[PDB]
C-alpha cells in the first residue's frame, strides 16, 4: 500500500476496511510495514529524499534486484537483506485509492517511487473503496450487512470474529444488536453520514447527507419539505442533472454512510477569500457567488453571512441576486438615485418586482406565451430566438457605466461610507464578472434542487421565472469553481480565527 495500514489504521477504519488479526497473506502486511519503516528511516537520513529511487522501486515492487560509497549503497544493501529475508516468490505491488484525500496524504518517499512504478488504482463508487478487489479481500475484513430481513444470530450464517465485520443497516442500536443477538465479538463499522434514495419525476434519485441519521430526523416515507433546510445545507445529489427531485418526493430508503470529504480546490478558493477577510492590508473583501435561478441560494448565503460574522467578529453584508433589478425597477426614472446600503437592502424584499422580470414578461406576452404549458410546448429554435432578444435587454445595462448602470450600482454600493467591509454579492451569469465588484475570488454554487423543476412547481411567477432560468443557464457555463454549501460551512470551521 501507499499509506501503511498498521501505523495509520484509523484512516482505513473510515472506509470500512478493518484489519484481519495478526496464512501467507498475513505475513505480507508485516513485511510491508517493515519496508515502510525502513524507507522512512532512509529518507529522513538524507534531507527527506531517497538517493537512488529507481533501485528502491525495483527492489520493493518487483523484488528482482539484490545489492551487495558509504552514503550511496549501504542503505541499498540494508534494504536488500531485508527484502531477501522475506523469501517472497514475487514483489509487492504499490496500491493507491482513487480518493483525493488518500492521494494527498501519501508520503514523499512513496511519491518518489510512484514515478517508477505501475501502481494499482482502486476505484471508489460512493467514496467507499470497493470490497471486490484482491488486495482488499485478502488484507482487510469483509463487511456483512444486517438488514430487517437479514437479522439473525451469527450461527445461522458462517460468520467468525476473525473474518467478517458487521454493517448495522437495520435501524436499531448497536449495543441492542450486540447484546440481544450475539454479536459481542464482532466489530461494527461506523458510518457518520447518510444515504437517502428519493422518489422522483424521472426515476429513483440518491442523495448523500453529511448529517448522522439521528441528527437528520427523517425516516422512510417522509416528505421532501420536512427538514429541507438541513438537507439543503448538507446534501449532494449523485445523479445527473436534471434529476427528478421536487417538493413532493418521498423517501424510499435511508442508510448510514461515509461522510463526504470537502474538495481541496473549493476550500482553497474559500480560504483565499478568508485571507482577504482577515488581513488589514485589504480594504474591501468581496465574494461573488454564482448559481442557477432557483437553487435556493439566499437561504443558505444569509446564514453563511451569519456564521462568518460570528466567527470573524466583523459585520458582513449580503446583497441578493435580484438587488440591482429591484433597485432599478424603482429608480430607473429618478435623475439622482440613492445608493445607500440600507436603502438597497430595504428594496431587496421579495414582494418587489424586478426590472428583468417586467421586461421578460412583456417579451413573453409579445409572443403570446402566458402559460407554463405554452412555454414547455415551444421548440428549441423558438426558445433560443427569444433568449437572443433577452440578451439585447441584458447588454444595455452591462454595456456602459452611466448613472443607472450595473457597474455603477455595484461600485457605489461597494465603495460607500456606511456599507459593510466584507460583502457577499450574488450573481446570475458569467457576463457580470466585469460588472460585479473587484474580487479575486468568485465561485459557482450547486445545491440539491432541480431548478427547472422548482421554477415549474412554483405558482407565483411561473413562465417568467422559468424563462429567466433558462436564459441564465444559457449565459452561465460552469467555468468557475464549483462549491457546495457543506464545503462553504466546513471552510469556516477549518479556518483558524485570530
Amino acid at each position: 500500500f501507499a499509506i501503511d495500514p498498521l501505523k495509520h489504521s484509523k484512516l482505513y477504519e473510515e472506509y470500512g476496511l478493518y484489519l484481519r488479526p495478526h496464512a501467507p497473506t498475513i505475513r505480507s502486511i508485516k513485511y510491508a510495514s517493515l519496508i515502510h519503516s525502513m524507507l522512512a528511516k532512509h529518507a529522513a537520513r538524507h534531507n527527506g529524499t531517497l538517493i537512488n529511487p529507481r533501485m528502491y522501486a525495483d527492489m520493493i515492487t518487483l523484488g528482482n534486484t539484490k545489492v551487495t560509497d558509504i552514503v550511496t549503497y549501504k542503505a541499498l544493501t540494508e534494504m536488500s537483506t531485508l527484502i531477501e529475508s522475506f523469501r517472497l516468490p514475487s514483489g509487492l505491488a504499490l496500491i493507491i485509492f482513487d480518493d483525493e484525500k488518500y492521494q494527498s496524504l501519501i508520503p514523499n518517499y512513496i511519491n518518489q517511487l510512484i514515478a517508477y512504478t505501475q501502481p494499482h488504482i482502486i476505484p471508489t463508487w460512493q467514496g467507499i473503496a470497493d470490497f471486490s478487489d484482491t488486495y482488499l479481500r485478502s488484507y482487510f475484513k469483509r463487511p456483512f450487512e444486517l438488514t430487517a430481513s437479514n437479522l439473525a444470530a451469527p450461527q445461522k450464517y458462517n460468520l467468525s470474529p476473525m473474518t467478517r465485520s458487521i454493517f448495522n443497516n437495520t435501524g436499531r442500536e448497536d449495543a441492542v444488536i450486540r447484546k440481544l443477538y450475539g454479536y459481542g465479538e464482532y466489530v461494527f463499522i461506523r458510518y457518520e453520514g447518510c444515504l437517502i434514495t428519493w422518489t422522483g419525476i424521472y426515476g429513483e434519485v440518491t442523495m448523500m447527507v453529511n448529517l448522522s441519521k439521528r441528527d437528520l430526523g427523517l425516516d422512510v416515507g417522509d416528505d421532501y419539505l420536512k427538514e429541507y433546510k438541513k438537507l439543503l445545507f448538507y446534501g449532494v445529489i449523485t445523479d445527473a442533472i436534471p434529476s427528478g427531485i421536487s417538493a413532493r418526493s418521498t423517501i424510499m430508503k435511508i442508510s448510514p454512510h461515509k461522510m463526504m470529504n470537502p474538495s481541496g480546490g473549493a476550500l482553497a478558493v474559500l480560504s483565499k477569500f478568508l485571507e482577504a477577510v482577515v488581513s488589514t492590508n485589504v480594504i474591501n473583501a468581496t465574494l461573488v457567488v454564482y448559481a442557477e435561478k432557483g437553487a435556493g441560494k439566499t437561504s443558505f448565503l444569509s446564514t453563511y453571512a451569519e456564521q462568518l460574522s460570528l466567527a470573524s467578529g466583523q459585520v458582513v453584508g449580503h446583497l441578493s441576486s435580484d438587488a440591482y433589478g429591484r433597485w432599478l425597477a424603482k429608480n430607473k426614472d429618478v435623475e439622482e438615485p440613492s445608493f445607500a446600503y440600507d436603502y438597497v437592502l430595504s428594496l431587496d424584499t421579495d414582494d418587489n418586482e424586478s426590472y428583468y422580470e417586467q421586461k421578460a414578461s412583456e417579451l413573453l406576452i409579445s409572443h403570446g406565451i402566458s402559460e407554463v404549458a405554452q412555454y414547455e410546448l415551444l421548440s428549441v429554435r423558438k426558445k433560443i430566438k427569444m433568449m437572443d432578444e433577452m440578451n439585447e435587454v441584458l447588454i444595455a445595462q452591462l454595456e456602459n457605466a452611466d448613472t443607472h448602470s450595473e457597474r455603477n450600482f455595484y461600485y457605489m454600493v461597494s465603495t460607500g461610507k456606511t456599507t459593510p467591509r466584507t460583502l457577499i454579492v450574488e450573481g446570475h451569469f458569467n457576463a457580470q464578472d466585469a460588472t460585479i465588484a473587484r474580487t479575486d475570488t468568485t465561485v459557482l454554487l450547486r445545491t440539491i434542487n432541480d431548478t427547472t423543476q422548482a421554477m415549474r412547481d412554483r405558482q407565483r411567477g411561473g413562465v417568467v421565472q422559468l424563462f429567466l432560468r433558462d436564459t441564465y443557464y444559457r449565459l452561465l457555463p460552469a467555468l468557475h469553481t464549483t462549491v457546495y454549501p457543506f464545503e462553504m460551512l466546513e471552510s469556516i470551521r477549518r479556518w483558524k480565527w485570530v
Binding site: 510512484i114 485589504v282 440578451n391 479575486d440 468568485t442 460552469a478 469553481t481
Partner: protein, 1196 residues
C-alpha cells in the same frame, strides 16, 4: 567662439584647425554648466513672433510662435483633479486625468501627517512629478538639449531659427536652470518653484522636434506648428490630450491619397524584386469614401485649429503620392514627441486592464459529457460564432492529438523548471505529484506586470509563474501545435530587412485587391469568460483523443461520468491531459492584483487576462484564426464566393488580403467584420484599396512609409543611464542605423549623432589613489586632457575626470561611427563616410587613409604616418583603447542590438518554447564544465533567456555610479604604455592598403533605376538621392542568402557572421587544440547547426595554419534595408587591371573591397567606373594564404 561661426560649420570638413576648434567647443559644452546656460539662453538672440517659409513639399506656409498663458503662469494645484472614492479605497470611477496636470510646481504640498490616506496619495503624486519624469537616455537633459541645438546651429549656419525662441521663452527663468536632475537622488530638483510641472517633458519634446528638423521631416515653419500643437495639448493634461488626438490627427492620408487620382508605383514579385512600374488609380471605393464625412466632422471638432488648417492644406495641395507621404510624415511628427508615457500604475490600471463588454453576449456550448462535479469534459456548440469557429478548429484535433501523444510531459515540465537534475527531480517528486499543488495553484494570486511604450498607454502583460502556469501548461502544449499545421500565424524569425515586409510589398502591387488591418491590442480586455469557452471546446476535443498516462498529479483511470440522455453515471477511461485541461477550464480566475503604496492590495474585476505570455497568445491566435477561417467555410456552406487569400495574425494585428470582384471583396469584408462584432469585439477594420497599416510600418502601393517617431533617441524606459561608454555608443549606433530609412535626410542624422556622442558621451570619471594621483595625471596628460579634483584627507582615494579626445568616436575598437573628411598632408580629403559604411575591422582603414594609401603604394611604405595622427588625437584615442579602462560588453548584451521586430507574437512564443533544446545545451555546458573545459555563460544557448527571466524577479537597485579604480597595477601599466607609445600595426593590416582611381567611363544602371524613380520606395531614396542611386547601382536583395541566414538563425535564435575574434571561436579553438573528443559536446552546448559546425571545423584548421587573417566587416541588416548583402553585385562597377590575375587568386576578396568602398563613397559617387590599385605588400600577403582562410564563411 560660437558654434555657428566655426570652420566646421561653414565647410563641414575636419582640417587641423577646424578639428581642434570644434573639439575645444564641444569639450566646453560637455563639462561646464555655465557654458550650457549661456549657449542656450544668450542675450544676443532675437526672438521670433512671426515667421515664414516653405512647408515639407515646398509650398509657402505662415506660422506664429504662440506660447499659452496656462504654461507661462500655471494654475495652483487643484486637489479635485485626482478624486477618490467615498470609501477612499481607490480613485474615482470616471476620472479624467491619468497623467500629470499642468499646474504650478510649488503648489503640491502635503501638510498631512504620515501614515494617512492623503499623505500617501500626495507622496505618490510627488513621486509622479519628480521621479517619473526622469527618463533620459545618455546624459543630463540640458546636455541632450544642447546637442540638438548645437547640431541645428552647425547645420543651418544661423542662430535665427524658431526652436531656440521656444527654448528661451520656456526655460529661461533666472540666471540658473529652472530644474536639474540628480543621479544620486534619482529625481528632478526644482529650482524655480513658480514653474509649470510639465517642462521636464518639454525638454525631451524640444529634443525630439529638433531631431525631426535635422531629419528633414519637419521644416522650421512646421516646427512652429508642431510646438504650438504640443503647447496647446499641455492644458490641462498633456498626455491625455495627445492620446485623445493621436489617431484622428493621422487618419487623413486616406482622403489625401484619394484626392491624388492616379499614381505610378513599382510592382514587386513574390521573390523580393521590383519587376516594373504601373500607372494605377488611387481613387477609393464608395464604402471607403463614406468614412470621409465622419472623419472631417471629427477633425473639425476636436483638433487644434492651426493643425487642422495644416491637415486641410495637405488634403487640397498634395499632387502626388510622394507629396502625401511627406505631409503624412510631417503630421506624424506633429502628433508624437517620442517620449515614453509613464504614470502612477494605479492611475492607468483602470483604463489599461479593466474588462469591458462589447456589442453582444457570448453564450455556452452544450455540455455533452461531464465530471461528477458537473465540470465539462466534452462539449459542443448549437449555433453561432462558437459553431463557426469550431467548424474550422475541429478539423485539426485528430492530427494534433498524434503530436501531443508523442512527447513526454513530465520531462517537459522538468525542462521548464530547470531552464527557468537529480535535485530538480526530487523537487518535482515532492511538489508536483501531490494534489496539494493544484490547491496551491488555485490559492496563490496573480501579480500585475506592466510595460511602458511610446505613443501608447501603459500595457498590462502577464508574467511567468511556477504555479498559475502549471495549470495552463497543458492547454498551451495542445494549442501550440497549429503553428506547424497552418499558414495563418506569423511566428517565424524576423530578418530585419525589406525581406521581412516582402509579402505586403507583393499584395499591394497586385490588381483588384482589398486590404484589411484590425488593431487588436485591446482584445484581452474584451475577451470574457464565455469567450474563452470557444477555445476550451477545441482543447477538450484534442484531449479526449489524446492518450497520456501521467501528467502528475493526474492519472489515467476509470472515472465516473455523466452523459446526455443517461440518467445515471457512466464510467470511461479518462486520461491525464483530459483531467488537466478539464480542471484548468473549470477553475478560472483572470483577475490580477497590484499591491500599491496608497491603497494596499488592489485587485481587478474578474474577466480580462493580459496578453503577454505564450499560453495566452496562443489563445488569442487560435480563436481569431478559427473565427475568420470558419467564416470562409460558412460562406461556402451558404453558397457565396470566398475571396480571401491570406491571414497573418501578427503580434497586434490581423491582416487580411481580399482579391476578386469589388462586390465580392466588400461582402466578405463586411461578413468578417460582423462576425467579430458577434463574438464580442468592437473592432473596426481599416478597409483600403491601396495602403495597409501596421505598427511601425505603412505599405502604400509597393512603397514603405516608415515611422521615424517610434525611435526615441533621447528617452528610455529601463533607466539604466550609467556612464558605460561602450554600451552607450553601441546603443547610439543601433538607434542611428535604425532611423536610417525612416529619415528623409541621413546627413542630418550623422551630424546629430556626432554632436550627441561629442557632448553627451564625452566625460568619464575614474578614482585614483592619493599617492599615485599626480603621477597618473602627468602620464596621461600628454595625450588627453584631464580635470583634477580636490584631494580629501578623510579618505583613501580621490576622483579625477577623463574627458575623451573627440577622435575616439571614429576609432576601430573603441567608439565607432561614420567620419567626416579629414585633411591629408597634400590637401586632399578622405572620402565622406556614408550611413552605409561597415564597422568592425574595416574602421582601421581610416588610419591608413589619412596616412595616404596613394602615397604608400607609390613609395612602397606600410608603416603609418604618426605625426598627423598625433595631431588629430588618434594616438591618444588608441592609447585610451589599449589601456582597457572602459567598460566591457558581454555577448548577451551584444545580442540586444535593440531592433524593433515586426510581430511580437514571436517574442511571446520565444520565452516558453524550445525547452528540450535549451535543456540539452545546459546539460552539455555543465557536463563539459565537469570535464575541465568550462565555457563562459554568454556562449551557452539558454543563458540569454534564463538571465532575463531571473532578472525581472528581483527588485534590487541597478543604479550605482560607475567609478574606475586606478590602483598600483593599472598605474604601472600606464607608465609602461605612455612612455613609449606609438601605434601598433598587426601584420594583417596589409589588406587595408588598396585604392580606387576614377575612370572616365560611365556605368550602366540597373533596369529598376527607372521603375523606382516615380514614387519612392522609402523616405531617403527620393529621386537622385544617395539611397536611390545606391539601389540603382547595387540592386538588393539576395533572397537565397536571407533564407539561408534565417534557416541558420532558426537553431541559435539569432544570426551572427563568423569572426576569428569571436569568444565562441576562441573557446572552441582551445577545446580543438587540447581535447578534440569534446567538440561534439561543445557544438551541442553552443547549439550549432550542421552548417555552422562545418564552418567552425574549417576555421579551426585554417587558424592552426595561418592565424587571424580574415577581412572582417560588420553591416547591420537594418542599416541595409533595401540594399544587397552579396558583394558580387559590385563586380561590374570596378575594373580590375589584368596584371593582378597573373599574381593572385582572390577575386571575391576584391569584390568585397569594391562593395565596401562603394557603400562608403555613395555620397560622392556620380556614376563613373573605378580602377583597383593594389599594394605590393598586399599582394605578397595574399599569395601566402589561401582565400578560404581569409573568408571562411563563404563557399568558393
Amino acid at each position: 567662439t560660437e558654434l555657428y561661426n566655426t570652420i566646421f560649420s561653414e565647410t563641414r570638413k575636419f582640417t587641423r584647425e577646424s578639428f581642434k576648434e570644434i573639439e575645444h567647443l564641444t569639450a566646453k559644452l560637455a563639462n561646464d554648466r555655465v557654458a550650457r546656460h549661456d549657449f542656450l539662453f544668450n542675450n544676443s538672440i532675437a526672438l521670433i513672433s512671426d515667421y515664414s517659409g516653405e512647408d515639407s513639399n515646398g509650398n509657402q506656409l505662415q506660422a506664429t510662435v504662440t506660447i499659452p498663458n496656462e504654461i507661462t503662469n500655471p494654475k495652483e494645484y487643484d486637489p479635485s483633479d485626482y478624486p477618490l472614492a467615498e470609501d477612499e479605497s481607490f480613485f474615482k470611477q470616471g476620472h479624467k486625468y491619468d497623467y500629470l496636470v499642468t499646474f504650478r510646481a510649488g503648489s503640491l504640498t502635503n501638510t498631512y501627517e504620515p501614515k494617512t490616506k492623503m499623505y500617501k496619495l500626495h507622496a505618490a503624486l510627488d513621486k509622479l512629478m519628480h521621479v517619473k519624469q526622469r527618463k533620459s537616455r545618455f546624459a543630463d537633459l540640458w546636455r541632450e538639449l544642447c546637442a540638438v541645438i548645437a547640431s541645428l546651429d552647425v547645420w543651418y549656419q544661423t542662430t535665427n531659427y524658431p526652436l531656440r525662441t521656444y527654448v528661451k521663452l520656456l526655460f529661461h527663468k533666472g540666471d540658473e536652470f529652472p530644474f536639474y536632475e540628480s543621479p544620486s537622488q534619482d529625481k528632478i530638483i526644482f529650482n524655480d518653484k513658480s514653474v509649470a510641472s510639465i517642462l521636464p517633458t518639454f525638454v525631451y519634446t524640444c529634443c525630439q522636434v529638433g531631431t525631426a528638423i535635422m531629419s528633414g521631416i519637419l521644416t522650421h515653419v512646421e516646427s512652429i506648428v508642431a510646438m504650438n500643437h504640443f503647447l496647446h495639448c499641455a492644458k490641462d493634461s498633456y498626455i491625455d490630450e495627445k492620446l485623445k488626438i493621436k489617431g484622428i490627427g493621422r487618419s487623413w492620408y486616406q482622403e489625401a491619397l484619394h484626392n491624388v487620382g492616379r499614381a505610378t508605383v513599382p510592382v514587386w514579385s513574390q521573390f523580393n524584386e521590383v519587376i516594373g512600374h504601373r500607372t494605377k488609380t488611387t481613387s477609393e471605393p464608395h464604402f471607403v469614401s463614406s468614412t470621409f464625412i465622419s472623419l472631417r466632422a471629427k477633425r473639425a471638432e476636436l483638433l487644434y485649429p492651426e493643425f487642422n488648417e495644416y491637415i486641410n492644406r495637405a488634403l487640397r495641395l498634395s499632387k502626388t503620392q510622394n507629396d502625401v507621404a511627406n505631409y503624412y510624415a510631417a503630421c506624424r511628427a506633429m502628433t508624437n514627441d517620442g517620449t515614453f508615457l509613464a504614470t502612477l500604475t494605479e492611475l492607468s490600471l483602470d483604463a489599461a486592464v479593466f474588462p469591458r463588454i462589447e456589442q453582444r453576449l457570448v453564450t455556452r456550448p452544450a455540455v455533452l459529457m461531464s465530471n461528477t462535479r458537473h465540470e465539462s469534459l466534452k462539449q459542443k456548440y448549437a449555433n453561432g460564432v462558437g459553431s463557426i469557429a469550431q467548424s474550422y478548429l475541429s478539423s485539426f484535433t485528430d492530427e494534433i492529438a498524434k503530436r501531443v501523444n508523442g512527447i513526454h510531459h513530465d520531462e517537459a515540465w522538468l525542462n521548464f523548471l530547470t531552464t527557468s537534475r537529480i535535485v530538480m527531480q526530487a523537487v518535482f517528486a515532492r511538489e508536483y505529484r501531490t494534489p496539494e499543488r493544484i490547491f496551491k495553484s488555485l490559492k496563490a494570486p496573480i501579480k500585475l506586470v506592466e510595460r511602458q511604450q511610446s505613443d501608447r498607454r501603459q500595457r498590462a502583460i502577464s508574467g511567468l509563474d511556477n504555479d498559475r502556469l502549471f495549470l495552463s501548461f497543458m492547454p498551451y502544449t495542445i494549442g501550440k501545435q497549429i503553428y506547424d499545421l497552418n499558414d495563418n500565424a506569423a511566428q517565424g524569425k524576423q530578418a530585419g530587412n525589406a525581406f521581412d515586409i516582402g509579402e505586403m510589398l507583393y499584395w499591394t502591387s497586385q490588381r483588384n485587391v482589398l486590404l484589411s488591418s484590425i488593431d487588436v491590442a485591446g482584445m484581452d480586455a474584451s475577451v470574457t469568460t464565455n469567450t474563452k469557452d470557444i477555445y476550451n471546446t477545441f482543447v477538450l476535443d484534442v484531449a479526449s483523443k489524446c492518450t497520456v498516462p501521467r501528467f502528475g498529479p493526474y492519472y489515467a483511470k476509470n472515472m465516473e461520468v455523466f452523459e446526455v440522455g443517461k440518467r445515471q453515471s457512466q464510467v470511461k477511461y479518462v486520461n491525464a491531459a483530459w483531467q488537466a485541461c478539464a480542471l484548468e477550464a473549470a477553475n478560472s480566475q483572470t483577475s490580477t492584483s497590484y499591491e500599491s503604496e496608497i491603497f494596499g492590495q488592489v485587485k481587478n474585476a474578474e474577466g480580462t487576462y493580459p496578453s503577454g505570455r505564450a499560453d495566452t497568445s496562443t489563445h488569442h491566435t487560435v480563436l481569431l484564426q478559427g473565427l475568420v477561417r470558419g467564416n470562409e467555410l460558412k460562406r461556402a456552406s451558404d453558397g457565396k464566393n470566398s475571396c480571401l487569400t491570406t491571414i497573418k495574425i501578427l503580434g497586434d494585428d490581423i491582416m487580411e488580403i481580399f482579391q476578386g470582384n469589388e462586390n465580392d471583396t466588400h461582402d466578405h469584408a463586411v461578413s468578417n467584420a460582423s462576425i467579430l462584432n458577434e463574438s464580442g469585439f468592437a473592432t473596426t477594420a481599416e478597409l483600403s484599396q491601396n495602403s495597409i497599416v501596421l505598427l511601425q510600418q505603412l505599405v502604400v502601393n509597393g512603397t514603405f512609409w516608415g515611422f521615424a517617431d517610434r525611435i526615441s533617441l533621447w528617452t528610455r524606459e529601463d533607466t539604466k543611464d550609467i556612464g558605460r561608454l561602450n554600451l552607450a555608443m553601441m546603443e547610439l549606433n543601433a538607434l542611428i542605423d535604425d532611423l536610417l530609412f525612416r529619415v528623409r535626410r541621413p546627413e542630418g542624422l550623422k551630424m546629430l549623432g556626432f554632436f550627441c556622442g561629442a557632448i553627451c558621451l564625452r566625460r568619464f570619471t575614474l578614482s585614483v589613489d592619493n599617492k599615485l594621483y599626480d603621477s597618473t595625471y602627468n602620464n596621461l596628460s600628454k595625450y588627453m586632457t584631464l580635470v583634477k579634483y580636490d584631494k580629501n584627507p578623510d579618505f583613501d582615494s580621490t576622483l579625477m575626470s577623463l574627458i575623451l579626445p573627440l577622435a575616439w568616436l571614429f576609432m576601430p575598437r573603441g567608439g565607432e561611427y561614420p567620419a567626416y573628411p579629414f585633411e591629408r598632408r597634400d590637401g586632399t580629403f578622405t572620402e565622406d563616410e556614408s550611413m552605409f559604411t561597415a564597422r568592425g575591422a574595416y574602421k582601421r582603414r581610416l588610419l591608413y587613409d589619412v596616412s595616404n594609401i596613394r602615397e604608400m603604394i607609390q613609395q612602397n611604405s606600410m608603416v603609418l604616418d604618426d605625426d598627423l595622427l598625433h595631431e588629430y588625437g588618434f594616438t591618444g584615442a588608441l592609447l585610451l583603447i589599449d589601456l582597457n579602462i572602459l567598460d566591457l560588453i558581454d555577448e548577451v548584451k551584444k545580442e540586444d542590438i535593440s531592433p524593433v521586430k515586426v510581430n511580437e507574437l514571436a517574442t511571446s512564443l520565444e520565452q516558453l518554447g524550445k525547452l528540450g533544446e535549451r535543456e540539452k545545451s545546459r546539460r552539455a555546458a555543465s557536463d563539459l564544465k565537469i570535464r575541465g573545459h568550462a565555457l563562459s555563460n554568454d556562449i551557452v544557448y539558454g543563458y540569454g533567456l534564463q538571465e532575463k527571466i531571473q532578472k525581472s524577479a528581483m527588485a534590487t537597485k541597478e543604479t550605482t555610479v560607475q567609478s574606475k579604480r586606478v590602483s598600483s597595477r593599472l598605474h604601472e601599466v600606464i607608465v609602461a604604455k605612455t612612455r613609449d607609445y606609438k601605434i601598433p600595426t598587426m601584420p594583417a593590416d596589409a589588406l587595408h592598403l588598396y585604392e580606387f582611381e576614377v575612370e572616365d567611363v560611365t556605368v550602366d544602371l540597373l533596369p529598376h533605376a527607372k521603375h523606382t524613380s516615380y514614387s519612392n520606395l522609402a523616405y531617403n531614396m527620393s529621386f537622385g538621392s544617395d539611397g536611390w542611386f545606391a539601389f540603382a547601382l547595387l540592386g538588393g536583395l539576395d533572397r537565397s542568402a536571407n533564407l539561408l541566414r534565417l534557416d541558420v538563425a532558426s537553431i541559435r535564435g539569432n544570426y551572427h557572421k563568423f569572426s576569428y575574434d569571436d569568444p565562441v571561436f576562441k573557446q572552441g579553438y582551445k577545446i580543438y587544440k587540447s581535447d578534440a573528443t569534446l567538440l561534439n559536446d561543445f557544438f551541442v552546448a553552443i547549439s550549432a547547426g550542421p552548417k555552422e559546425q562545418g564552418i567552425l571545423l574549417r576555421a579551426f584548421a585554417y587558424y592552426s595554419l595561418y592565424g587571424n587573417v580574415e577581412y572582417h566587416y560588420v553591416l547591420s541588416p537594418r542599416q541595409l534595408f533595401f540594399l544587397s548583402d552579396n558583394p558580387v553585385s559590385a563586380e561590374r562597377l570596378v575594373r580590375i587591371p589584368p596584371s593582378y590575375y597573373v599574381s593572385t587568386q582572390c577575386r571575391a576578396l576584391y569584390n568585397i573591397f569594391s562593395y565596401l568602398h562603394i557603400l562608403r563613397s555613395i555620397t560622392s559617387n556620380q556614376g563613373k567606373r573605378l580602377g583597383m590599385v593594389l599594394h605590393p605588400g598586399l599582394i605578397a600577403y595574399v599569395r601566402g594564404t589561401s582565400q578560404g582562410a581569409i573568408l571562411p564563411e563563404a563557399d568558393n
